[PDB]
Amino acid sequence: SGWTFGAGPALQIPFPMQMAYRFNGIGVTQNVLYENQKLIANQFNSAIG
């Protein structure tokens, strides 16, 4: 759900779109995430590992 589960009813939303939301919230455009999605995913997986 993202952040809506803590401010009211839960709303379903794809996780890449939630990541685009969180990237646009800090000033970075959503295109860098919508294009380089595989790189961000691999970096996140490597960090989690």
Binding site: P16, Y34, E35, N36, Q37
Partner: peptide, 19 residues
């Protein structure tokens, strides 16, 4: 490069006014 994009058409606020 975008994964999950669909084909559609967008509107232009200049084409109908000019044509």
């Amino acid at each position: 490069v975008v994964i999950g994009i669909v084909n559609n058409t967008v509107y232009d606020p200049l084409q109908p006014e000019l044509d």
